[PDB]
Amino acid sequence: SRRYDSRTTIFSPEGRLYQVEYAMEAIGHAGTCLGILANDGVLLAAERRNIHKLLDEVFFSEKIYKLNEDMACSVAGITSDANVLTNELRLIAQRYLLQYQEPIPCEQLVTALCDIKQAYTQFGGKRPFGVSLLYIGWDKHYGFQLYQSDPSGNYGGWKATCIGNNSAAAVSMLKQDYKEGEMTLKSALALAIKVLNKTMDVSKLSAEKVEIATLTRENGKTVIRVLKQKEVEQLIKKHEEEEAKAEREK
Amino acid sequence: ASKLPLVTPHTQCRLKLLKLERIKDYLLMEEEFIRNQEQMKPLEEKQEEERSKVDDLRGTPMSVGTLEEIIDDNHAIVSTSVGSEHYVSILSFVDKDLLEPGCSVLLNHKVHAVIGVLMDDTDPLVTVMKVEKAPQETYADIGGLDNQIQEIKESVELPLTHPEYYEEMGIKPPKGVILYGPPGTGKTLLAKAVANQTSATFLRVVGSELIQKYLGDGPKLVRELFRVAEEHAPSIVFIDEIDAIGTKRYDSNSGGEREIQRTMLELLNQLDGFDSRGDVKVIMATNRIETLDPALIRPGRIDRKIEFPLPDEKTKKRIFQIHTSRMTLADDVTLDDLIMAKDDLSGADIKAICTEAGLMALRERRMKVTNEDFKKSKENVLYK
Ligand SMILES: Nc1ncnc2c1ncn2[C@@H]1O[C@H](COP(=O)(O)OP(=O)(O)OP(=O)(O)O)[C@@H](O)[C@H]1O
Ligand SMILES: [Mg+2]
Fold first, then answer.
1. Where in the sequence is Phosphoserine found (chain A)?
2. If you write DSSP's letter for every residue of B272-313 in order, what string do you get?
């Protein structure tokens, strides 16, 4: 019977293991997501993959998942794998809320998830998840926060990160265009439209091909608003105006 | 021709004078010794008389033959070019020492008797696999490694240049040297500086081209290869990319891996055979060190195991300095921003960026290389 066993848990003779590196190999494909903030609010930009003309285009989101009433995540990887993870940590937030009667610190939520993801990587003889994701949310301790999961089971605190197909190429411009605490949530918007303009090999920036979520702090709301497709394209052409004069004056 | 091998005083001494004076009297003895033979035995010219007597023995239609056996009393069985072999005899001007089975000889037209032997027109492959000249610059071109270079001179060059050190130690040099690491890490590049440095007969073979479509043609190619390596001199056999025999399967091979296996077995003989090996060194290089048979990697077959790490950033700037040495660098650039652009860039990456940037200047007919050349250059080189 052990002939059929594949040993998805042991190490390589070079010390590492290959399975999660195949997973993080797969996470480089099939999706393009990023997040950015410097100020009140935090934005998520996700490129839609399925762009066939016969889609009912419902459920309010594609890779955007409202977790708590003040935090949300954008996901990347295998969708069907992700769906268990979404509602999975969702009632962990709810059992926190039941346990303390309080919303959860976003970071300690993320750690608690990354334990579970870490466990399959660690034992069980179990195929892990090729799913990585971002984290937006607000707290009373640090306000707006930004975090990044890895399918390995470790995470990262950031402010603005793309895990696209051309993710490092985006990041190269992300550390070429930013300002610490001052990129307000329109400057980061037009910055972001440039970023997805860059890594978008499909040019002309189809407003239906992308998704953008916002998380602001209203007084007792923490308004998380996915803006409609009536105001994407004005930001698109708004980028298109400044790029024409900006090229033309050179 | 090899008259006196002794030079050992090496000064202005009456020793070295009396040497020649003795050998002076002997060579004059040979002169006037042979001088009387034609003085009292003219009888011929002896410079061409006996010579054209030989050439009046042998006919002008000199058929080209090939040996297959030897009977000592100057007759043997010799194969014709048609194949219908004979049992002719052998002459006295045949200088019967250069006679091995399969050699080309000279036969009569009439009785096909073994007139003479034939020097063999080398071999097309010997030249093909034989490296002629030094490829490029010395070890100063590399930079940054500086430790395993001492290892390579240690196992290779120092045995050549100083065969005193092993003898005062009571020791022989290490046999087999292997090179492994990430790709593009200068593995072949070091071997070029070795091929610069050495005077030995150098051979180079890719591990990919060992495989054949004929059965046993691989191992036969091995056997004649080590024949070629042994028969020449202090020789350096290099193999690149020996993993490719195990990685890729090709449908040109009639056999599967159970012919590849036999190839590796015959090679495995040629590393550690019971026969007297001789002065042939073995340098190997690949990037997938974990994949092949460790039986080839045993001490006795390979003694020295050499990894090539990724470059650290202070070595990176040196490699930039090398690949930016002779070029008209416009002072717009800063190399240190170019260092940390990729965390794990190779030495091939730097030269790729530099050369591609020169291509960008030659798009605009310029002579010096500006900053945006590098800006869009790493966009070309890295991100795709
Ligand atoms: N340390 C270095 N200093 C200068 N140039 C380097 C260095 N490392 C690599 N290069 C450049 O990279 C090129 C590739 O070198 P080489 O082919 O020897 O690397 P390799 O590891 O053998 O590559 P491969 O893995 O494809 O066989 C060389 O021509 C060389 O100019
Ligand atoms: Mg190479």
1. 12, 74, 172
2. S-SS---SEEEEEEES-TTSS-GGGGSTTT--EEEE--PPPH
Bridge partners of residue A47, in order along the sequence: A210
The experimental method behind these coordinates is cryo-EM
What are the tokens at A250?
A: 């050179």
Tell me the C-alpha distance between A163 and A166, whole Å.
8
Ligand 1 first shell, C-beta below 6 A: B 142-144, 183-189, 287, 319, 322, 346-348, 351
User: Of all helices (H) and strands (E), which one includes residue B363?
Assistant: helix B347-363
SS3 labels along chain A:
CHHHCCCCCCCCCCCCCCHHHHHHHHCCCCCCEEEECCCCCEEEEEECCCCCCCCCCCCCCCCEEECCCCEEEEEEECHHHHHHHHHHHHHHHHHHHHHHCCCCCHHHHHHHHHHHHHHHHHCCCCCCCCEEEEEEEEECCCEEEEEEECCCCCEEECCCEECCCCHHHHHHHHCCCCCCCCCCCCHHHHHHHHHHHHHCCCCCCCHHHEEEEEECCCCCCCCEEECCCCCHHHHHHHHHHHHHHHHHCC
Strands (DSSP E) contained in B144-276 are 176-180, 201-206, 235-240
Whole-angstrom Cα distance, residue B290 to residue B180? 10
How many angstroms separate the CA atoms of B348 and B340, rounded? Answer: 16
Q: Do B383 and A166 touch (CB under 8 A)?
A: yes
Chain B residues near residue A177 by CB distance under 8 angstroms: none
Segment (H or E) for B104: strand B104-107
Q: How does DSSP assign B47-88, residue by residue?
A: SSHHHHHHHHHS-SS-EEEEE---BTTTB--EE-SSS--B--
Nearest residue to B149 (alpha-carbon basis) of B176, B181, B186 = B186
Q: Which residues pair with A189 in a beta bridge?
A: none
Which residues of B fall within a CB distance of 8 Å from A14? 290
Which residue among B290, B341, B383 sits closest to A14, beta carbon to beta carbon? B290
